[PDB]
Coordinates of C-alpha atoms and ligand atoms in Angstrom, one line a residue:
Chain Y
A1 CA -132.1 63.5 31.6
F2 CA -135.0 61.5 33.1
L3 CA -136.9 61.3 29.8
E4 CA -134.1 59.2 28.3
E5 CA -134.5 56.7 31.1
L6 CA -138.0 55.3 30.2
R7 CA -137.1 52.2 28.2
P8 CA -135.8 48.7 29.3
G9 CA -132.1 48.3 29.6
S10 CA -129.9 48.5 26.4
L11 CA -126.2 47.9 25.9
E12 CA -126.3 50.1 22.8
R13 CA -128.1 53.0 24.5
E14 CA -126.5 52.9 27.9
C15 CA -122.9 51.8 27.2
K16 CA -122.2 52.4 23.4
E17 CA -123.9 55.8 22.8
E18 CA -123.1 56.7 26.4
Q19 CA -120.6 55.7 29.1
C20 CA -122.0 53.2 31.5
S21 CA -121.0 52.3 35.1
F22 CA -120.3 48.7 36.2
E23 CA -123.7 48.2 37.8
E24 CA -125.6 49.5 34.7
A25 CA -123.6 47.0 32.7
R26 CA -124.3 44.2 35.3
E27 CA -128.1 44.9 35.0
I28 CA -127.8 44.3 31.3
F29 CA -125.7 41.1 31.4
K30 CA -126.8 39.8 34.8
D31 CA -124.4 37.0 35.1
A32 CA -121.2 37.9 37.1
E33 CA -118.7 36.3 34.6
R34 CA -120.4 37.8 31.5
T35 CA -120.4 41.2 33.2
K36 CA -116.7 40.9 34.3
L37 CA -115.7 39.8 30.8
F38 CA -117.3 42.9 29.2
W39 CA -116.1 45.3 31.8
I40 CA -112.5 44.3 31.8
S41 CA -112.0 45.7 28.3
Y42 CA -114.7 48.3 28.3
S43 CA -113.3 50.1 31.3
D44 CA -109.7 49.5 30.2
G45 CA -109.0 52.7 28.2
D46 CA -107.3 53.0 24.8
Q47 CA -103.5 53.1 25.8
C48 CA -102.8 54.3 22.2
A49 CA -104.8 57.5 22.8
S50 CA -101.6 59.3 23.9
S51 CA -99.9 58.4 20.5
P52 CA -96.8 56.8 22.1
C53 CA -95.4 55.5 18.8
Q54 CA -92.8 57.8 17.3
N55 CA -91.2 58.2 13.9
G56 CA -94.3 57.2 11.9
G57 CA -94.9 54.0 13.9
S58 CA -98.2 52.3 14.5
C59 CA -99.9 51.6 17.8
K60 CA -102.1 48.6 18.7
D61 CA -104.0 48.7 22.0
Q62 CA -103.8 45.9 24.5
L63 CA -105.1 45.5 28.1
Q64 CA -103.4 48.4 30.1
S65 CA -100.6 48.4 27.4
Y66 CA -99.9 48.8 23.8
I67 CA -97.6 47.5 21.0
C68 CA -95.7 49.8 18.6
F69 CA -94.9 48.6 15.1
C70 CA -92.0 50.6 13.7
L71 CA -90.9 51.6 10.2
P72 CA -87.8 49.7 9.1
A73 CA -85.3 52.5 10.1
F74 CA -86.5 52.5 13.7
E75 CA -86.7 50.4 16.8
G76 CA -87.5 50.8 20.6
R77 CA -90.7 50.3 22.6
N78 CA -91.9 53.6 21.1
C79 CA -89.9 53.5 17.9
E80 CA -87.7 56.1 19.5
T81 CA -84.3 54.7 18.3
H82 CA -83.0 55.8 14.9
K83 CA -81.1 52.9 13.3
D84 CA -79.4 55.5 11.1
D85 CA -77.8 57.1 14.2
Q86 CA -76.0 53.9 15.4
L87 CA -73.1 53.8 13.0
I88 CA -70.5 53.4 15.8
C89 CA -67.6 51.0 16.2
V90 CA -69.2 49.0 19.1
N91 CA -72.2 48.2 16.8
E92 CA -71.0 45.3 14.6
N93 CA -67.6 46.9 14.1
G94 CA -69.2 50.0 12.5
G95 CA -69.8 47.8 9.4
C96 CA -66.0 47.9 8.8
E97 CA -64.4 44.7 7.5
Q98 CA -61.2 45.1 9.5
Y99 CA -60.5 48.1 11.7
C100 CA -63.0 50.8 12.9
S101 CA -62.3 54.3 14.2
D102 CA -64.9 56.4 15.9
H103 CA -64.9 60.2 15.3
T104 CA -67.4 62.2 17.5
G105 CA -69.1 65.0 15.7
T106 CA -68.5 63.1 12.5
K107 CA -68.8 59.7 10.7
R108 CA -66.6 56.8 11.8
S109 CA -64.0 55.6 9.4
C110 CA -62.7 52.1 8.5
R111 CA -59.0 51.1 8.2
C112 CA -57.0 48.0 7.3
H113 CA -54.2 45.8 8.7
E114 CA -50.8 46.1 7.1
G115 CA -50.8 44.2 3.8
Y116 CA -54.3 45.5 2.9
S117 CA -55.8 48.8 1.6
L118 CA -59.3 50.2 1.9
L119 CA -61.5 49.8 -1.0
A120 CA -63.3 53.0 -2.4
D121 CA -66.6 51.8 -0.7
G122 CA -64.9 52.9 2.6
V123 CA -65.5 49.6 4.5
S124 CA -64.0 46.6 2.6
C125 CA -60.2 45.8 2.5
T126 CA -58.1 44.2 -0.3
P127 CA -54.6 42.6 -0.2
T128 CA -51.7 44.7 -1.6
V129 CA -49.3 41.8 -1.2
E130 CA -49.2 38.2 -2.5
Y131 CA -49.6 36.5 0.9
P132 CA -51.4 38.9 3.3
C133 CA -51.8 37.8 6.9
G134 CA -54.8 35.8 7.9
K135 CA -55.9 34.3 4.6
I136 CA -55.5 30.5 3.8
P137 CA -54.3 30.4 0.1
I138 CA -54.4 26.6 -0.2
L139 CA -58.2 26.7 -0.1
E140 CA -58.4 29.1 -3.1
Chain E
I1 CA -55.6 18.5 21.0
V2 CA -58.3 16.3 22.4
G3 CA -61.4 15.6 20.3
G4 CA -60.3 17.7 17.4
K5 CA -59.7 16.9 13.7
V6 CA -56.6 16.7 11.5
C7 CA -55.9 20.2 10.1
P8 CA -55.7 19.4 6.3
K9 CA -52.2 20.3 5.2
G10 CA -51.8 24.0 4.5
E11 CA -55.0 25.0 6.2
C12 CA -53.3 26.1 9.4
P13 CA -50.4 27.8 7.6
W14 CA -49.4 30.0 10.6
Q15 CA -48.7 27.1 13.0
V16 CA -45.1 26.8 14.2
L17 CA -43.4 23.8 15.6
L18 CA -40.7 24.7 18.1
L19 CA -37.8 22.3 18.6
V20 CA -35.0 22.3 21.2
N21 CA -31.9 20.1 20.5
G22 CA -34.1 18.8 17.6
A23 CA -36.9 17.5 19.9
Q24 CA -40.5 18.8 20.0
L25 CA -40.9 21.5 22.5
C26 CA -44.1 23.6 21.9
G27 CA -46.3 25.3 19.3
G28 CA -46.2 29.0 18.2
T29 CA -47.8 31.4 15.7
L30 CA -46.1 33.1 12.9
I31 CA -47.2 36.8 12.7
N32 CA -45.0 38.1 9.9
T33 CA -41.8 36.7 8.2
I34 CA -39.5 37.2 11.1
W35 CA -41.5 37.0 14.4
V36 CA -43.3 34.2 16.1
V37 CA -45.6 34.3 19.2
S38 CA -45.5 31.4 21.7
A39 CA -46.0 30.8 25.5
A40 CA -43.4 31.9 28.1
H41 CA -43.8 28.6 30.0
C42 CA -42.4 26.7 27.0
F43 CA -39.0 28.0 28.0
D44 CA -38.9 27.3 31.7
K45 CA -36.6 24.3 31.4
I46 CA -34.3 25.4 28.5
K47 CA -30.5 25.2 29.1
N48 CA -29.4 25.2 25.4
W49 CA -30.6 28.7 24.2
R50 CA -28.6 28.4 20.9
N51 CA -30.4 25.2 19.9
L52 CA -34.0 26.4 19.4
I53 CA -35.5 26.0 16.0
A54 CA -38.8 27.1 14.5
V55 CA -40.3 24.9 11.8
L56 CA -42.9 26.5 9.4
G57 CA -45.0 24.5 6.9
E58 CA -44.9 21.4 9.1
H59 CA -47.8 19.0 9.0
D60 CA -46.8 15.3 9.5
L61 CA -44.0 15.0 12.0
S62 CA -43.1 11.6 10.5
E63 CA -42.3 12.7 7.0
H64 CA -40.3 15.7 5.7
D65 CA -41.6 17.4 2.5
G66 CA -40.6 20.4 0.6
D67 CA -43.0 22.8 2.3
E68 CA -41.1 22.7 5.7
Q69 CA -38.9 25.7 6.4
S70 CA -36.6 25.7 9.5
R71 CA -35.1 28.8 11.1
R72 CA -32.9 29.3 14.1
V73 CA -34.5 31.2 16.9
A74 CA -32.3 34.3 17.5
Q75 CA -34.2 35.9 20.5
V76 CA -36.9 34.8 23.0
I77 CA -38.5 37.8 24.7
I78 CA -40.7 37.2 27.7
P79 CA -42.4 39.8 30.0
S80 CA -40.3 40.5 33.1
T81 CA -43.5 40.1 35.1
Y82 CA -43.7 36.4 34.2
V83 CA -42.7 34.0 36.9
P84 CA -41.4 30.6 35.9
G85 CA -43.6 27.8 37.2
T86 CA -46.7 30.0 37.2
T87 CA -49.5 30.9 34.7
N88 CA -49.8 34.8 34.5
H89 CA -48.2 36.7 31.5
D90 CA -47.7 33.5 29.6
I91 CA -46.4 34.9 26.3
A92 CA -43.1 34.9 24.4
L93 CA -42.1 36.8 21.3
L94 CA -39.4 35.0 19.2
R95 CA -37.2 36.6 16.5
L96 CA -36.1 34.2 13.7
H97 CA -32.5 34.6 12.5
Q98 CA -33.6 34.7 8.9
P99 CA -37.0 35.4 7.6
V100 CA -39.3 32.6 6.4
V101 CA -40.5 32.7 2.8
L102 CA -44.3 33.0 2.5
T103 CA -45.8 30.3 0.4
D104 CA -49.2 28.5 0.0
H105 CA -48.1 26.5 3.1
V106 CA -46.5 29.3 5.1
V107 CA -48.5 32.4 5.9
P108 CA -48.6 34.7 9.0
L109 CA -51.7 35.2 11.2
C110 CA -52.7 38.8 11.6
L111 CA -51.9 40.4 15.0
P112 CA -54.9 42.6 15.5
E113 CA -55.2 46.2 17.0
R114 CA -56.1 46.1 20.7
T115 CA -59.4 47.9 20.5
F116 CA -60.6 45.9 17.5
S117 CA -59.6 42.7 19.4
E118 CA -61.4 43.7 22.7
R119 CA -64.6 45.2 21.2
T120 CA -65.1 43.0 18.2
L121 CA -63.0 39.7 18.1
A122 CA -63.7 39.0 21.8
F123 CA -67.4 38.5 20.9
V124 CA -66.9 36.1 18.0
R125 CA -68.1 32.9 19.8
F126 CA -65.9 30.2 18.2
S127 CA -62.2 30.2 17.3
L128 CA -59.7 27.5 16.3
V129 CA -56.9 26.1 18.4
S130 CA -54.2 23.8 17.0
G131 CA -51.1 21.8 17.6
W132 CA -49.3 18.4 17.7
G133 CA -50.0 18.0 21.5
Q134 CA -51.6 15.1 23.4
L135 CA -54.6 13.4 21.9
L136 CA -55.9 12.4 25.4
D137 CA -54.9 13.8 28.9
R138 CA -51.5 12.2 29.7
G139 CA -51.6 10.3 26.3
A140 CA -49.4 10.2 23.3
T141 CA -48.8 13.3 21.2
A142 CA -50.0 13.7 17.5
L143 CA -48.1 13.1 14.4
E144 CA -50.4 15.1 12.2
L145 CA -51.3 18.7 13.0
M146 CA -54.7 18.8 14.9
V147 CA -57.2 21.6 15.1
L148 CA -60.3 22.2 17.3
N149 CA -63.2 24.7 17.3
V150 CA -63.7 26.2 20.8
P151 CA -66.2 28.8 22.1
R152 CA -65.0 31.6 24.3
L153 CA -66.3 32.6 27.8
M154 CA -66.2 35.8 29.7
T155 CA -64.3 35.1 32.9
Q156 CA -67.3 35.6 35.2
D157 CA -69.1 32.7 33.3
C158 CA -65.9 30.5 33.3
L159 CA -65.6 30.9 37.1
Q160 CA -69.3 30.2 37.6
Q161 CA -69.2 27.0 35.4
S162 CA -65.9 25.6 36.6
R163 CA -65.5 23.0 39.3
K164 CA -63.6 24.4 42.3
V165 CA -60.1 23.1 42.8
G166 CA -58.2 24.0 46.0
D167 CA -55.3 26.4 45.4
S168 CA -55.9 26.6 41.6
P169 CA -54.4 29.6 39.7
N170 CA -56.4 32.8 39.5
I171 CA -57.9 33.5 35.9
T172 CA -56.5 37.1 35.5
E173 CA -57.3 39.9 33.1
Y174 CA -54.2 38.6 31.0
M175 CA -56.2 35.3 30.4
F176 CA -59.5 34.0 29.0
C177 CA -61.3 30.6 29.0
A178 CA -62.4 28.8 25.9
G179 CA -63.7 25.2 25.3
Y180 CA -66.1 22.8 26.9
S181 CA -66.6 21.6 30.4
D182 CA -68.0 18.2 29.4
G183 CA -64.7 16.3 29.0
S184 CA -65.0 16.1 25.2
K185 CA -62.7 18.6 23.7
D186 CA -59.8 20.8 24.7
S187 CA -56.2 21.8 23.9
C188 CA -53.4 20.0 25.8
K189 CA -49.9 20.4 27.3
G190 CA -47.9 19.9 24.0
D191 CA -50.2 22.4 22.2
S192 CA -48.8 25.2 24.5
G193 CA -47.7 28.3 22.7
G194 CA -50.0 27.5 19.7
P195 CA -52.6 29.9 18.2
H196 CA -56.2 30.5 19.3
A197 CA -57.1 32.1 16.0
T198 CA -60.4 34.0 15.3
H199 CA -62.1 34.4 11.9
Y200 CA -63.8 37.8 11.3
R201 CA -65.2 39.0 8.0
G202 CA -62.8 37.1 5.9
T203 CA -59.6 37.4 7.9
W204 CA -58.0 35.4 10.6
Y205 CA -56.5 37.0 13.7
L206 CA -54.4 36.0 16.7
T207 CA -56.5 36.3 19.9
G208 CA -55.1 33.7 22.3
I209 CA -52.1 31.5 23.1
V210 CA -52.5 27.9 24.3
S211 CA -51.5 28.3 28.0
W212 CA -52.8 26.1 30.8
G213 CA -55.7 24.1 32.2
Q214 CA -56.7 21.6 34.8
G215 CA -55.5 18.5 33.0
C216 CA -56.9 18.2 29.4
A217 CA -60.7 18.0 28.7
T218 CA -61.4 17.5 32.3
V219 CA -65.1 17.6 33.3
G220 CA -65.9 21.0 35.0
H221 CA -63.0 22.8 33.5
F222 CA -62.1 24.9 30.3
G223 CA -58.9 25.6 28.6
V224 CA -57.1 28.8 29.6
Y225 CA -55.5 31.0 27.0
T226 CA -53.2 34.0 27.2
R227 CA -55.3 37.2 26.3
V228 CA -53.1 38.6 23.4
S229 CA -55.1 41.8 23.2
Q230 CA -53.4 42.9 26.5
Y231 CA -49.9 42.6 24.8
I232 CA -50.4 44.3 21.4
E233 CA -48.4 47.5 22.2
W234 CA -45.8 45.4 24.1
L235 CA -45.3 43.1 21.0
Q236 CA -45.3 46.0 18.5
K237 CA -42.7 48.0 20.4
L238 CA -40.5 44.9 20.8
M239 CA -40.7 44.0 17.1
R240 CA -39.2 47.4 16.4
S241 CA -36.3 46.8 18.9
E242 CA -32.6 46.1 18.1
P243 CA -31.3 42.6 18.3
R244 CA -29.1 41.8 21.4
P245 CA -26.2 39.2 21.9
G246 CA -27.9 36.6 24.2
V247 CA -31.0 34.7 23.2
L248 CA -33.3 35.3 26.2
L249 CA -34.6 38.8 26.9
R250 CA -36.9 39.5 29.9
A251 CA -38.4 42.9 28.8
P252 CA -40.5 45.3 31.0
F253 CA -44.3 45.0 30.9
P254 CA -46.3 47.1 30.3
Chain O
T1 CA -70.5 50.0 39.2
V2 CA -73.3 47.6 40.3
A3 CA -74.5 44.7 38.2
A4 CA -78.0 44.6 36.7
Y5 CA -80.5 42.2 38.3
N6 CA -84.0 41.0 37.7
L7 CA -83.5 40.7 34.0
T8 CA -87.0 40.0 32.6
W9 CA -88.2 39.3 29.1
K10 CA -91.4 41.3 28.1
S11 CA -92.7 40.0 24.8
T12 CA -96.1 40.1 23.1
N13 CA -96.6 39.2 19.4
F14 CA -92.8 39.0 19.1
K15 CA -92.3 42.6 20.2
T16 CA -89.6 41.8 22.7
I17 CA -88.1 44.0 25.4
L18 CA -85.6 43.1 28.0
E19 CA -86.0 44.9 31.3
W20 CA -83.8 45.1 34.4
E21 CA -82.9 47.0 37.6
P22 CA -81.5 49.3 38.9
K23 CA -82.0 52.9 37.8
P24 CA -78.5 53.9 36.9
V25 CA -76.5 56.3 39.0
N26 CA -73.2 57.2 37.5
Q27 CA -73.3 54.2 35.2
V28 CA -74.7 53.3 31.8
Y29 CA -75.6 49.9 30.2
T30 CA -75.0 48.1 27.0
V31 CA -76.9 44.9 26.1
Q32 CA -75.7 41.9 24.2
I33 CA -77.7 39.0 22.8
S34 CA -76.8 35.7 21.1
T35 CA -78.0 32.3 20.3
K36 CA -76.2 29.4 22.0
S37 CA -73.7 29.0 19.3
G38 CA -73.8 32.4 17.6
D39 CA -71.7 35.6 18.1
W40 CA -72.8 38.3 20.6
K41 CA -74.5 41.3 19.0
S42 CA -74.6 44.5 21.0
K43 CA -77.6 46.8 21.4
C44 CA -78.8 49.9 23.3
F45 CA -75.2 51.2 23.5
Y46 CA -74.4 53.1 26.7
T47 CA -78.1 53.6 27.5
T48 CA -79.3 55.1 30.7
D49 CA -82.7 53.3 30.1
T50 CA -83.4 50.1 32.1
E51 CA -84.9 48.5 29.1
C52 CA -83.7 47.4 25.6
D53 CA -85.8 46.6 22.6
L54 CA -84.5 43.3 21.1
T55 CA -87.4 42.7 18.7
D56 CA -85.2 43.2 15.6
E57 CA -82.7 40.5 16.6
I58 CA -85.3 37.9 17.7
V59 CA -87.5 38.1 14.7
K60 CA -84.6 37.0 12.5
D61 CA -85.5 33.4 13.9
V62 CA -88.4 33.2 16.3
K63 CA -87.7 29.5 17.1
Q64 CA -84.0 30.0 18.3
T65 CA -83.3 30.2 22.0
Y66 CA -81.6 33.5 22.9
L67 CA -79.5 34.6 25.9
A68 CA -78.9 38.3 26.7
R69 CA -76.6 40.0 29.1
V70 CA -76.5 43.5 30.4
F71 CA -73.1 45.2 31.0
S72 CA -72.5 48.0 33.5
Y73 CA -69.9 50.7 32.7
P74 CA -69.0 53.5 35.0
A75 CA -69.6 57.1 33.9
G76 CA -66.8 58.8 31.9
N77 CA -66.4 55.4 29.9
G78 CA -60.5 44.1 31.6
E79 CA -64.1 42.8 31.7
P80 CA -67.0 45.0 32.9
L81 CA -69.6 43.7 35.5
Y82 CA -72.6 42.0 33.9
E83 CA -75.5 39.8 34.5
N84 CA -77.1 37.2 32.2
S85 CA -80.8 37.0 31.4
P86 CA -83.0 33.9 31.4
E87 CA -83.0 32.0 28.2
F88 CA -85.8 33.1 25.9
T89 CA -87.4 31.2 23.0
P90 CA -89.8 33.6 21.3
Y91 CA -92.0 31.0 19.5
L92 CA -92.5 29.2 22.8
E93 CA -92.8 32.1 25.2
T94 CA -94.0 35.4 23.5
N95 CA -97.5 36.4 24.8
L96 CA -100.4 36.2 22.4
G97 CA -101.8 39.7 22.0
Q98 CA -105.4 40.7 22.8
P99 CA -107.6 39.9 19.8
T100 CA -110.3 42.0 18.2
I101 CA -113.7 40.8 16.8
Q102 CA -113.7 42.2 13.3
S103 CA -117.3 41.4 12.4
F104 CA -120.3 39.1 12.9
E105 CA -122.9 38.4 10.2
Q106 CA -126.0 36.4 10.2
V107 CA -126.2 34.2 7.1
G108 CA -128.9 31.6 7.2
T109 CA -129.7 30.5 10.8
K110 CA -126.1 30.8 11.8
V111 CA -123.7 33.6 12.6
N112 CA -120.2 34.0 11.3
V113 CA -117.8 35.6 13.8
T114 CA -114.5 36.9 12.2
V115 CA -111.4 37.6 14.3
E116 CA -109.2 40.4 13.1
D117 CA -105.8 39.1 11.9
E118 CA -103.4 39.7 14.8
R119 CA -100.3 41.6 13.6
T120 CA -96.9 40.6 14.9
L121 CA -93.4 42.2 14.7
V122 CA -92.1 39.5 12.3
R123 CA -91.6 41.1 8.9
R124 CA -91.8 39.6 5.4
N125 CA -91.3 41.7 2.3
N126 CA -92.4 45.1 3.8
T127 CA -95.4 43.7 5.6
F128 CA -95.9 42.4 9.1
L129 CA -96.9 38.8 9.4
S130 CA -100.1 37.8 11.3
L131 CA -100.1 35.4 14.3
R132 CA -101.6 32.8 12.0
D133 CA -98.8 33.5 9.4
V134 CA -96.3 32.7 12.1
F135 CA -97.9 29.9 14.1
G136 CA -100.1 28.2 11.4
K137 CA -101.8 25.2 12.8
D138 CA -100.2 25.7 16.2
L139 CA -102.7 28.6 16.7
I140 CA -106.4 28.4 17.2
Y141 CA -109.0 31.0 18.3
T142 CA -111.7 30.2 20.9
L143 CA -115.1 31.9 21.1
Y144 CA -117.0 32.4 24.4
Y145 CA -120.5 33.3 23.6
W146 CA -124.0 33.3 25.1
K147 CA -127.6 33.9 24.6
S148 CA -128.8 36.8 26.8
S149 CA -131.9 35.1 28.0
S150 CA -130.3 31.8 29.1
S151 CA -127.8 30.8 31.9
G152 CA -124.6 29.1 30.9
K153 CA -121.9 29.7 28.4
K154 CA -121.0 28.2 25.1
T155 CA -117.5 27.8 23.7
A156 CA -116.5 27.2 20.0
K157 CA -113.0 26.7 18.6
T158 CA -111.5 27.3 15.1
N159 CA -108.4 26.5 13.1
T160 CA -108.9 29.7 11.0
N161 CA -110.0 33.2 12.1
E162 CA -113.7 32.5 11.6
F163 CA -116.4 30.8 13.6
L164 CA -119.7 29.6 12.1
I165 CA -122.1 29.0 15.0
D166 CA -125.8 28.0 15.3
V167 CA -128.0 30.5 17.0
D168 CA -131.7 30.4 18.0
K169 CA -134.1 32.6 16.1
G170 CA -134.7 36.2 17.2
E171 CA -132.3 36.3 20.1
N172 CA -129.2 38.4 21.0
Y173 CA -125.9 36.8 21.5
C174 CA -122.7 38.3 22.7
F175 CA -119.2 37.1 21.8
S176 CA -115.6 37.3 23.1
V177 CA -112.5 35.6 21.6
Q178 CA -109.0 34.4 22.6
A179 CA -105.9 33.4 20.8
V180 CA -104.6 30.0 22.1
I181 CA -101.6 27.9 21.3
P182 CA -102.9 24.5 22.6
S183 CA -99.4 22.9 22.6
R184 CA -98.2 25.2 25.3
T185 CA -98.3 24.3 29.0
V186 CA -97.6 27.9 30.2
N187 CA -98.8 31.2 28.7
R188 CA -101.3 29.3 26.5
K189 CA -103.9 32.0 25.9
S190 CA -104.3 35.7 25.2
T191 CA -106.5 37.9 27.3
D192 CA -110.1 37.9 26.1
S193 CA -111.1 40.3 23.3
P194 CA -113.6 43.0 24.1
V195 CA -117.2 41.7 24.2
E196 CA -119.3 42.4 21.1
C197 CA -123.0 41.8 20.9
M198 CA -125.7 41.8 18.2
Ligands
BGC301 C1 -99.4 57.4 26.2 O1 -98.1 57.8 25.9 C2 -97.2 57.8 27.0 C3 -95.9 58.5 26.6 O2 -96.1 59.5 25.7 C4 -97.0 56.4 27.5 O3 -96.2 56.5 28.7 C5 -98.3 55.8 27.9 O4 -98.1 54.4 28.2 C6 -99.3 55.9 26.7 O5 -100.6 55.5 27.2
FUC302 C1 -99.2 51.7 11.0 O1 -98.1 50.8 10.7 C2 -96.9 51.6 10.5 C3 -95.7 50.6 10.3 C4 -97.0 52.5 9.4 O2 -97.1 51.8 8.1 C5 -98.2 53.4 9.5 O3 -98.4 54.2 8.3 C6 -99.4 52.6 9.8 O4 -100.5 53.5 10.2
CA303 CA1 -128.4 59.3 25.4
CA304 CA1 -129.9 51.0 37.6
CA305 CA1 -106.7 48.9 26.2
CA306 CA1 -43.2 16.9 8.1
CL307 CL1 -32.2 22.6 26.6
CL308 CL1 -31.9 30.6 10.2
CL309 CL1 -59.9 40.7 24.6
CL310 CL1 -104.0 36.0 13.1
MG311 MG1 -127.0 53.5 18.5
MG312 MG1 -128.4 53.2 32.2
MG313 MG1 -128.3 46.9 40.1
RB314 RB1 -125.4 55.5 30.7
RB315 RB1 -129.7 56.6 29.4
RB316 RB1 -130.3 50.4 34.9
RB317 RB1 -53.2 49.3 5.8
RB318 RB1 -58.2 30.2 42.0
RB319 RB1 -59.1 14.7 31.8

């Protein structure tokens, strides 16, 4: 609209209220390095606009990239991994103190060496004999 | 053990001293009241099979005390695959003639399940090795039980960090490296058969047997240990077997 | 199986992702990470991704030196093939994220410029720590600013997240800021903030 083009140059009018091209911005800032400094971010795009952070995460925009901050139960570049879904024996022994058995479709279980029995907590083991294997009584 | 510490009396209560004709032979590991694990190569030179003794509760080889318990070794079982004078399948399972009595000074180390040992114990970095072996390469042996903390390597890393030696033994799937390549700290010949013991969530488990190395604490080399996880089913089946009349038994493996 | 290769640490504000090649074909990966003397922890179990978020392990201690390794396992499933990563020390190597100018105010004949607190992945008590929370005096912000009608740039530097600068009467100034860890030799500065003008 030519009637909106009657005033001297203005960052606010040309680039903030409207989109501006590199040369419009150059005519405002004039100096090559000032113009480049503005443009690098202004033309970059908000990489968080596609909402890439899942599971209630929070996105922060960067140059051509973003960072997701996850809720405590999640991880991954996009908070895509559910920590609650990782209870398997290759992940820190399934949280079992002694032996761990995977069961697909269902929850892993924990078990004990001979001389021990499983506590009611389902992970911890307790001796059932006076001198179970693998404990040093002299220290106690 | 080179560069270790004295194990305070009772603090390594599964360590076995093996004797032949009353003279120090090798270490071993008690795993319940009747059965001891040691290294096959400890038996390459034995003529007198009826004169092997296991001592439990031993600490200072210069003084006898009331914690020591001696038992005759009734059977020595080694994989048929093992070849005397070589390194592979370096394991022996020993049946004592009468059980030991468990005490504050005499306690077995737990033999772990295979999968637990491969997927969890194998990634515990440090473990302890012990014995009354040499205190320096080709030096005198120890009179008080010695113990050393060593970090474990996957075999690819051990190969990549080890100085090449022409015609040296292959490190096979039945072995693993542990220790330091800077000449400071290692297990030693007279420690052979002794435990590499791993602590995991409050319980100690047998993961390795002191087996071989290029000298002791040689720069550019690690200690090599028998990988006990490969033998769990072989040991458990043999521990259920019937005694036989002669001491030595070479049993099929797997 | 084929071993992973070009293992590369991507990390900004302690969000830390290990990347590698190749795209898997009939194989899957699992990653482990440790400190030099600690146990190996596994992550990203049997993934077909060629990346693994390790943020949660490294924020436990940002000043430790970690090594990772990527295992290859054949589809349908002694030691698997693997490759080690470079060592990574987060405090020394994590990128500083792009900052944002939060506000500028003219008070007196001077302008205060405030840099938004930069949020990092290190947690304390349900909240994420700022870059200044983590780095303290190791972190400064630098301000690149100019008067529109003059040639030449001006730089200011602060130990806090605020600059208080002198300005000439009735002129426009524009500003841009960077995070900087002066003690570093490599990866010392963030990218510049977007430019904000009066
Ligand atoms: C928008 O979100 C997609 C995935 O949903 C991501 O790949 C882009 O990086 C982001 O800008
Ligand atoms: C961004 O941060 C994440 C962690 C959540 O707290 C969100 O509610 C917030 O917008
Ligand atoms: Ca307009
Ligand atoms: Ca124009
Ligand atoms: Ca952006
Ligand atoms: Ca004694
Ligand atoms: Cl003899
Ligand atoms: Cl007897
Ligand atoms: Cl193993
Ligand atoms: Cl900050
Ligand atoms: Mg306006
Ligand atoms: Mg215009
Ligand atoms: Mg022009
Ligand atoms: Rb415009
Ligand atoms: Rb316009
Ligand atoms: Rb213009
Ligand atoms: Rb049990
Ligand atoms: Rb070799
Ligand atoms: Rb040596």
